[PDB]
Write a protein that binds this ligand. Structure first.
Ligand SMILES: O=c1[nH]c(=O)n([C@H]2C[C@H](O)[C@@H](COP(=O)(O)OP(=O)(O)OP(=O)(O)O)O2)cc1F
Ligand SMILES: [Ca+2]
Length: 427
DNA sequence: TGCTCACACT
DNA sequence: AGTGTGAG
């Protein structure tokens, strides 16, 4: 009976990352309710990142800025840079690289998004445990750490509660056994306090972390005590944790599959999966999903932290909603050329920085009237980092989609253009 | 929201 | 390949 305690895994997550990047650059905005927007001319801008001050008012991602100002009249905004008619994330990718390089000094990380990485600390934990003689862990080593499900048993202030929970954990900690999985988690989190202490010292950014035994738990745990805090979710907190945890809060159960787990099975919380056999779960959801759900609701997951701090694709997309859909052939050239131009800037940087070339160009369009994120994906070869050739070749492989009999028109009008560089080879 | 990115299925 | 899902 194996219990998924073999690894120590952490998930770190930059608290409102884009906001922090803007607040480091423009100090005026620090410690105020503020958000980052892109494209101001439509309803003040779509909001893509919201500080915690601003969230206390209810400002959320994907509002329009004009609606966020209704909820938060003193809300400060920063706008994303625009390059060649489109939002340009280069400042945030560069802060992201800053943080990931720091994290890498500690343990191998899997970049998961521009603002989070997973951390396999199985190996760093063993080494620390031998430098540590066997001496107890001081509560002073975990000054921003919450123990989930503690305190329990026979203080009205938040910091008060945390200390009581950490004292209880440490008081019962079995430091003489260099193999108790709870002790490894504790050491895992000491390493995460230091790793987080150095992000802040060396970039000024604050972040939250989750320390558990796999990636799903660490990600849940990270969310439990935001902002600027870390949470140990031990194997033993799982039954109480999952007992009232909605299915949709576990990673990858937030969409259609989770909804079917809810409907088909007639349950609400992750804990309720444990009453079904593995073959039962497989019969509703397939061999892989039933297996995955059977182990997960018992706190067991095996997805490895992959040693991958660089993306597999470089992508450049722009939407054209509404009357702004592209209706003329020479409109479609121009944006393609705009898209191929930013793609080229970024490809050359990536060759120079990271020693690889992309070999396949993926083009994708949206048609006025279709339903889905994409309406069509097509590819060709990517042999030169040249905007004019990349955009020419991208046109070539989409020109037949033009249903219009006219040459100078384009029917149906295009609602999105997308270029993606993939298939990387060492350079 | 829009602009990304990883991945499973076929 | 090309499509669909899930996420930040
Ligand atoms: O829908 C989105 N839009 C959207 O621009 N981004 C962008 C902007 C954001 O700063 C950055 C971070 O992604 P996160 O979803 O993890 O959120 P954070 O801002 O870092 O902090 P917290 O999770 O609120 O504590 O991606 C994510 C989306 F998911
Ligand atoms: Ca986050």
């Amino acid at each position: 009976m194996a219990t998924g305690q073999d690894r120590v895994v952490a998930l770190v997550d930059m608290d409102c990352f884009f906001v922090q990047v803007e607040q480091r650059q423009n100090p005026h905005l620090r410690n105020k309710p503020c958000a980052v927007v892109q494209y101001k001319s439509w309803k003040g801008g779509g909001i893509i990142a919201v500080s915690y001050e601003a969230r206390a008012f209810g400002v959320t991602r994907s509002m329009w800025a004009d609606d966020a100002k209704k909820l938060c009249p003193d809300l400060l905004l920063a706008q994303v840079r625009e390059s060649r008619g489109k939002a340009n994330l280069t400042k945030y990718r560069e802060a992201s690289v800053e943080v990931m390089e720091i994290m890498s000094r500690f343990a191998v990380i899997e970049r998961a998004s521009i603002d989070e990485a997973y951390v396999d600390l199985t190996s760093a934990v063993q080494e620390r445990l031998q430098k540590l003689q066997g001496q107890p862990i001081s509560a002073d080593l975990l000054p921003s750490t919450y123990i989930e499900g503690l305190p329990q048993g026979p203080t009205v202030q938040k910091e008060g509660m945390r200390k009581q929970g950490l004292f209880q954990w440490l008081d019962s900690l079995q430091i003489d056994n260099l193999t108790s999985p709870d002790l490894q988690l504790t050491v895992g989190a000491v390493i995460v306090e230091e790793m987080r202490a150095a992000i802040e010292r060396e970039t000024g950014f604050q972040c939250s972390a989750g320390i558990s035994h796999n990636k799903v738990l660490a990600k849940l745990a990270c969310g439990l005590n935001k902002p600027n805090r870390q949470t140990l979710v031990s194997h033993g907190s799982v039954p109480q944790l999952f007992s009232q945890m909605p299915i949709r809060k576990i990673r990858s159960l937030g969409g259609k599959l989770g909804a079917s787990v809810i409907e088909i099975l007639g349950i609400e919380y992750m804990g309720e999966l444990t009453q079904f056999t593995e073959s039962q779960l497989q019969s509703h959801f397939g061999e892989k999903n039933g297996s995955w759900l059977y182990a997960m609701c018992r706190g067991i997951e095996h997805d490895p932290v992959k040693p991958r701090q660089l993306p597999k694709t470089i992508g450049c997309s722009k939407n054209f909603p509404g009357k702004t859909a592209l209706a003329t052939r020479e409109q479609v050239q121009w944006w393609l050329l705009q898209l191929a131009q930013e793609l080229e800037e970024r490809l050359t940087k990536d060759r120079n920085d990271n020693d690889r070339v992309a070999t396949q160009l993926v083009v994708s369009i949206r048609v006025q009237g279709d339903k889905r994120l994409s309406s069509l994906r097509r590819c060709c070869a990517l042999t030169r980092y040249d905007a004019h050739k990349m955009s020419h070749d991208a046109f070539t492989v989409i020109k037949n989609c033009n249903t219009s009999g006219i040459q100078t028109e384009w029917s149906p009008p295009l609602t999105m253009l997308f270029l993606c560089a993939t298939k990387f080879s060492a350079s």
